[PDB]
RNA sequence: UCGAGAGGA
């Protein structure tokens, strides 16, 4: 129920999806990620009202490419990016801790 | 004086509204529906639809200052509202 | 790694200042917010009053208690009342402590968080211990008592998220910045005569090349480098805050992926 | 000139509530008047012995604060000891449109 | 892939900021064509135009086929993109200049162009302004 | 209380009032310009 | 009074209001608690018993539920104190008090109910907080303010009311208030301000947001517009952005003195098919002014579109501000030394002049102005003098304002703007006045203890030299305050005095209504007007238009009207029509040209009599001009080729249309005469703007198109006829009540005959 | 002052004009004064104008001055509304007032009349006069609680 | 009343320094800003909470009950 | 009613009559739409709240508390609302109590001069970031502390609605009083505008269906409320007229029914008839 | 049950 996926009605290869119990937190991230796809033809999102963590997002892509697969690839890329960031931070922090074991 | 009636053939917005309201009333009573149902569960929309394609069997007895009246069938009236 | 490049300029048990490059704006903003909001942590929820012979009102007191920072190393080992099948509460999803103080001498008796006594068993989990940054270790000043005032009460704290209520806020503050030289022209500095003098230079300016007047605006530029100083209240070390927030955002995206697979 | 006397201080011409008005000499008159008026409906603390006093319609602020920009009249007003309000952080801008 | 009905080189007569930080009002005289004068609003911020500059000015009568608006990334295959400042919009007006020239008016999202051409017999709704230099 | 204690009623602003009653502290409604404070 | 003319009622609610940018015009935020307290007694039918049954199963404890079930026998079953909610089976004709849901037409009221605009119904939009939501724009006609205003709620109980409300007080249906032939509402506050930044020439938008605004717009066509900027980078224009919101087919074309087809200042406003070209969007275009965008859209599409228009316009503007932001500050008020210095001399420049005249008066050399006392004239020039300096100071201050100045930006947009503010805000506040006079000697020959007796120096009599930012000296502060109470007194006094005036007027015209015979009588049937408003036309479809036949030189009108097919003076160009020499030399047609010309010539002198003032702009039905452009755009008419029209076709059509302008119906000549009288002015202009010469040279339309215009005109003309049964007097009274809240005792002097005049005077030519 | 005078060329032009403005009102005498335009003479005191010229002329006169008052603040309302009210003020062949001595002193339905500012007084007169109301009146219908014969109710379906 | 626990803006905990705050103010005879700096309240969003707070509790306790 | 027992006091008067006083307490948490006022006459109500992150934030990671529309300021001529923020801000940085007394030499110049010394924009501007993207906000925001206050008018204390509640006896009209389930006093104005709309029926509905609806019986012989209605027997009669056939049912306002009865007390004969004696 | 008074919109 957290994810309601429907096809768009105003353009081909287009879909509108609603995320429940979510806000711009994941919104801007996923939106930029999809915008970073070569094969996407359109992407954007919004919220009906501040009163809900209801998150409605429309996308369009090239022929023969599932927009749902676009989301999947976007998420995979994001998680890879986050793992890399975390590991970089872990190394940086271990060294900064060796430095900070004397001053905290 | 149905002949040479001294008024417009155009329905009045008030007249339109009253017709709509009466039909909504009788629909809510489950009166014989003059139209097929296209999912228009709203009685108000049912009335609006009958108005659109002209199936209301109503006639307005419009009054004049002198107390004289003209009876105008919705059939006679023109709907531009 | 080739991902976002991190360089800590300064680190402290209270706060850590660093630079994050090789990343887009959205990821930085998301990191900021997820740290701000989505972090499991422990906070006082249930307050049962045995006796209040104090000037301060009960609800006043409980409100303040809700603000007490807590040992939150292993909150992951702790669970949510929503999930936990215990009634009311239990150690698996809650921590129990008490406060019992009584005025003894006419002088004001300052009741501090250190007075708090953990009752439930931590299972050895590094959780629940009150957090004290006092030089004297007194702890947070809960309240004050008269010559012979009695105040006894029990508290049950539970695992929740700041987003649910600020009392679960582990993130004290987040300094955040980029393009100190405004090379991206994302702002038109307001000024009477000249922004250059009227506006002060941010300290980060020294770590980036000052722009050149003759340079055409590189419209292709993007905000890659970022400056972030994250300060925690004290519930958890800053490094843990960063790591855990990253992990939570990862979990959110992974849950999205799982929902996609489920449909 | 042959001045016979001198006001000990012009601010003396001011009123009780108006005394709470900061820099009143820079605002447009009726605006000042209204502020004096709302000063009769803002909450704070009425008296220290509220617990002793058995009354109705009490309203005690959880955390009264002394205004940053005080007025010389205040230290007679005792408003510093008994203020009503908070020095909140205000942002003069349009953010969400609401 | 285009059929531009106009093409000429214009020397920049004047550059006017017009109390704007990105766009300047610009006048220019067509090289070799005293009868062709160009008024144009240009985002100098992205196109560092200078006074007296000789710019290649033409209108994409037909879309310069790269071989709802198609997305960006139109650099994949080659077209009349050798130009530097390329705008799109509509032919605003077709005023007749003494039956000798046509002070046609154009708008580019509000950015305006006027040009005198009965010689440049171009007529349509929308096209692209192609500026090289 | 502070003002209300010093409040003054006018049974149903001149220069003389200068230095006597606050030209600003006046209620709204019909009382406006009638009820004064010292 | 307290029981019949007014009473308490039920099914009603009242609470404080709150805003919602995300909300539509006919929608309203309904506090969930209220919904749980208000329901509707709907009648069970086969087409709703299903959800009704479920609603009953939900019961009173659930937000989408019901509280009582009413059997046909009248058994108002209580589900609150009964488990029967899961047991009763609904039967047709049963009534169930269904919890008010969304989309339910409901009525509001902001008190005091000044006039009609106070009364609009809306659609329910439940919300989880304890206050009402209102779409920003509606407030002005509501005369609302979010300082904590409360508003009444009225919930209809009989569906006939639902429709009745839905067709008589639905928000869009009154978008134009007939009190002043202008939009009742418009864009306001931040949105008004923000647009200016959005629509300004200098703006540009990155694709990231352009993608966003499109889906942010609810009714977006789903089409990606082309970026204005291509080669150096993809980008669009705010003008482009706003155009997407606008619906197609709009052809508002406003010109200004600065309009030259180039408009470096982008004044005026020009849009084609919704595509913006010229003019920075300003209050004059999207405000409540009649000459603005909204009014046009209202007639070109109809109310049910404009509702979408607002939300579409609204939602965008707030967004683009969200990622831009907007603020102000003291810097917006401060100016440079030079500016203040210049102001400084300006004040001193006046002060000496005051001093100069002062000595002159002291000399007994200043003479008394005609019919006026030297004492007052001495003051009159004095107060006059001080006004200019205060005025010029703001003028001077205005010149040196930077574009970055937000307030200047605020004022230039017109959102709550006021020049005098900034001048007072920045320059000297200016003279204080009471009963329009300087400070009187409340003390013996003086005003305050700080001034010697018998002094008239500007400051000594209430002038203010310093600026608000500079801080008023006690002397200034006191004087400035004095004027305050004056305004304050009239503020309260009006809140009661106007109502008494207002109440009388309503009764005075209560039984005044329009009759189906196109006449006006009282409850006694006594005629008031033979033709309502003497034209039988509803004000709601009237707007000011040019009367071209009035203005211009005598030589002028003939040139722009007269055509000669025989001589050289007014030779028609044959190329204008597919027929050339076939027409030229045609005396028969030339005759046809004649009666029109003389007819127009008669009209010119006739209108001269009508409007002795020479003004050629007056409220009339149907914008002929607008329709013409629609025709041009209707088929993108080629105005460079001959047309198939013929003069006979032109001449007959105007004659035919005139015949078609039938408001009355009585075939008796007496009625027919009135019909001729009613449309007299309108037909004259019709002849004017439909003159063959104008029809040919300027308006190069096709025969098919030209006729389509005629058919188009009559359609609107008929639609514009005032409806019968109108409670016009009540409307007219309200038309007077409103402006009363904003000379006025003079009005009261009018309403109450009061033979004893206050200010008797004569005007002698 | 100037005037919008159509010039011999056909165009309206500014024509400066001298006009006398004075205190008081006496049309009877001034109208006899030579060297003036008696026809164009205007004044504030419409009440006198009506007496001087006629009820209908005053009706227009009232509009002008009323228009001036509304125009005085720069606001605008449609011509019709202004015209409607004044015309009512003269239907009785005289300058009717909207006060208790004018509009109220009518011959309409008492129930309509009673609800204005005087109720009990008129009530006695009605019984004294054995008056009877038509029920066409709104408030009378309101008192009855019946759909007034107006607008949406001005007709029978 | 009594010192708030967390910075209204930051949430940074402060209901522990009141004692040291007054110590520096009186025992060290410093100006307010000096101590606040010594207290680590770099952001004026934090400084404000402490510069303005008026201790009323000490007065309430003066009552016998 | 929402609260708990705070204190109960039991005592007697000088006469020994027992008296009890009960104190209860609750904490009101600022709700949307609650009135706030400045120290300058600026007022308003709460629009909507957010979480710290959502609101725009400073480079130094500072979250604003309250946001107000700039448009309000210049139109209302309230500079000091800005000035205090400047001086107040300086006070916080300088940690020195401010002085807002009038007619002093204090001026923006030294104030702003001092601010720049602390290292902040002399006019109080600051560079903010969108609380949704983090993208730098194109404009700069006026930002700083200020003293506000909370006014007694509580939204939850204002809400009020009802339907089919108790109705007041004298007129069978809806009772009045929020605590007493009061109605809304439908005044003269509303119907007037309704008349303008012309929604007569919806006028008939409220005045009738909302209240005062009542069935009455009238004698054709005399338009007087004198009909005996033996509903238990379906038997009717008008004594004096002794007519058992000219009885008609009518729905009239209950309050009006009293008026006629009041009028009949006045000795007036406002006889009513459903049959217009006029022919044409 | 009335009366008064405060306050809001
Ligand atoms: Mg208000
Ligand atoms: Zn547990
Ligand atoms: Zn802080
Ligand atoms: Zn009888």
From Swiss-Prot, chain B:
UniProt subcellular location: Cytoplasm; Nucleus
The entry's keywords: Cytoplasm, DNA-directed RNA polymerase, Nucleus, Phosphoprotein, Ribosome biogenesis, Transcription
One annotated Gene Ontology cellular component of this protein: cytoplasm
Predominant location: cytoplasm
GO molecular function ontology, one term from the record: DNA binding
Top-level taxon: Eukaryota
Gene Ontology terms: biological process: nucleolar large rRNA transcription by RNA polymerase I; ribosome biogenesis; RNA-templated transcription; termination of RNA polymerase I transcription; termination of RNA polymerase III transcription; transcription by RNA polymerase I; transcription by RNA polymerase II; transcription by RNA polymerase III
Location of region: Leucine-zipper: 37-58
Assigned protein family: Belongs to the archaeal Rpo6/eukaryotic RPB6 RNA polymerase subunit family.
Additional information: Present with 6090 molecules/cell in log phase SD medium.
Protein role: DNA-dependent RNA polymerases catalyze the transcription of DNA into RNA using the four ribonucleoside triphosphates as substrates. Common component of RNA polymerases I, II and III which synthesize ribosomal RNA precursors, mRNA precursors and many functional non-coding RNAs, and small RNAs, such as 5S rRNA and tRNAs, respectively. Pol II is the central component of the basal RNA polymerase II transcription machinery. RNA polymerases are composed of mobile elements that move relative to each other.
Known partners and oligomeric status: Component of the RNA polymerase I (Pol I), RNA polymerase II (Pol II) and RNA polymerase III (Pol III) complexes. Component of the RNA polymerase I (Pol I) complex consisting of 14 subunits: RPA135, RPA190, RPC40, RPA14, RPB5, RPO26, RPA43, RPB8, RPA12, RPB10, RPC19, RPC10, RPA49 and RPA34. The complex is composed of a horseshoe-shaped core containing ten subunits (RPA135, RPA190, RPB5, RPO26, RPB8, RPB10, RPC10, RPA12, RPC19 and RPC40) where RPA135 and RPA190 form the DNA-binding cleft.
Protein name as annotated: DNA-directed RNA polymerases I, II, and III subunit RPABC2
Whole-protein coverage range: 75 to 155 of 155
Curated annotation (Swiss-Prot), chain H:
Subcellular location: Nucleus
Crosslink site: Glycyl lysine isopeptide (Lys-Gly) (interchain with G-Cter in ubiquitin): 64
Modified how: The tandem 7 residues repeats in the C-terminal domain (CTD) can be highly phosphorylated. The phosphorylation activates Pol II. Phosphorylation occurs mainly at residues 'Ser-2' and 'Ser-5' of the heptapeptide repeat. The phosphorylated form of Pol II appears to carry, on average, one phosphate per repeat. The phosphorylation state is believed to result from the balanced action of site-specific CTD kinases and phosphatases, and a 'CTD code' that specifies the position of Pol II within the transcription cycle has been proposed.
Domain of life according to the entry: Eukaryota
Other observations noted: Mutagenesis experiments demonstrate that the minimum viable CTD contains eight consensus Y-S-P-T-S-P-[A-S-N-G] heptapeptide repeats. Identical and simultaneous substitutions in a number of consecutive repeats are lethal: 'Ser-2' -> 'Ala-2' (14 repeats), 'Ser-5' -> 'Ala-5' (15 repeats), '2-Ser-Pro-Thr-Ser-5'-> '2-Ala-Pro-Thr-Ala-5' (10 repeats), 'Ser-2'-> 'Glu-2' (15 repeats), 'Ser-5' -> 'Glu-5' (12 repeats), '2-Ser-Pro-3' -> '2-Pro-Ser-3' (15 repeats) and 'Tyr-1' -> 'Phe-1' (12 repeats). The binding of ribonucleoside triphosphate to the RNA polymerase II transcribing complex probably involves a two-step mechanism. The initial binding seems to occur at the entry (E) site and involves a magnesium ion temporarily coordinated by three conserved aspartate residues of the two largest RNA Pol II subunits. The ribonucleoside triphosphate is transferred by a rotation to the nucleotide addition (A) site for pairing with the template DNA. The catalytic A site involves three conserved aspartate residues of the RNA Pol II largest subunit which permanently coordinate a second magnesium ion.
Domain notes: The C-terminal domain (CTD) serves as a platform for assembly of factors that regulate transcription initiation, elongation, termination and mRNA processing.
Function: DNA-dependent RNA polymerase catalyzes the transcription of DNA into RNA using the four ribonucleoside triphosphates as substrates. Largest and catalytic component of RNA polymerase II which synthesizes mRNA precursors and many functional non-coding RNAs. Forms the polymerase active center together with the second largest subunit. Pol II is the central component of the basal RNA polymerase II transcription machinery. During a transcription cycle, Pol II, general transcription factors and the Mediator complex assemble as the preinitiation complex (PIC) at the promoter.
UniProt family annotation: Belongs to the RNA polymerase beta' chain family.
Name the UniProt record assigns to this protein: DNA-directed RNA polymerase II subunit RPB1
Name of the gene this protein is made from: RPO21
Portion of the parent chain present: 1287 to 1443 of 1733
